[PDB]
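Dock LU2; give full complex structure.
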Amino acid sequence: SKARVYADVNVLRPKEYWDYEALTVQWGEQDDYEVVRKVGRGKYSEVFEGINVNNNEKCIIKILKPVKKKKIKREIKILQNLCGGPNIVKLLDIVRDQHSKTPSLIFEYVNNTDFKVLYPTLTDYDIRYYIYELLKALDYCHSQGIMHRDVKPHNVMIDHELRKLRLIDWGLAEFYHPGKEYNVRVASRYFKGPELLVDLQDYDYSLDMWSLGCMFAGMIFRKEPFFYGHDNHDQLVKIAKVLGTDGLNVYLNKYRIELDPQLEALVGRHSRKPWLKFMNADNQHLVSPEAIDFLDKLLRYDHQERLTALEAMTHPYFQQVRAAEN
Ligand SMILES: O=c1cc(-c2ccc(O)c(O)c2)oc2cc(O)cc(O)c12
């Protein structure tokens, strides 16, 4: 299996571009940046609104928890490679504590509203707009040879007033190389593509399109997370109970994959549930044939069948957003 688009990006570029292990970091001044207030946290970092003391401008200070240096340089390399791309978070500086050497990444500040509060207020038009903005970021990183591998609302910062969106947390992102077998313990459970869940390791940028599909279903159906598995086995069961097992079977057969007996037994057999069965009084104003058609084209078991980010942006679902831009 191989990407249908941008498969040669890292092939054609100098090794300096994707060989992140050979990076030697230029450390800035730790004292340029002061923590103002904690805003976020996760397994690998803590995140603070900060102040650049030279120019009194806001910034984000992402303090990294202990991890292998390889992973730090990977995230730094990918951020440098993508800095300036549409809707990609801007890495501004890289600094460290002198005594403990704990690194922090300094980013542009985005005046975010949390998705659990923001999304329920978004009109049908806003959903189209912000998803279009997120697609610009994904097509860009894909075009630059990078898979994000952790698309989810928690990693999409939205300053709603300015209608500004940024794709953040590149800490699980990787360079795409034709034929490479990747770790499948990426993404957050509710957003893991079937490839991850059945152990297909030669995946590509299309993994992000599945994750975007999950985010999008959660928005239009007002069911967050859309596929709510308690563990990775359960996650595949939850998918199969919507897409149906006949489709899973064709998929597995195509890529010569068999499930673990325990996993196979848990998935069982399930008819496909048509998308309209998720419409209700709460989500009615958001669910249209174009939304459904676009969703259907993202949530396919076969990663090769999913729309690319570039095709996604051209879907008639976005035609109003494109017209506003043109
Ligand atoms: O502007 C924000 C920027 C970031 C951020 C930026 C880059 C990252 O690699 C990351 O992991 C988080 O994270 C936030 C997290 C928040 O809760 C609120 C925010 O405004 C931000």
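Observed: Residues 39-40, 45, 47, 60, 62, 89, 107, 109-110, 112, 157, 168-170 surround LU2 (CB under 6 Å).
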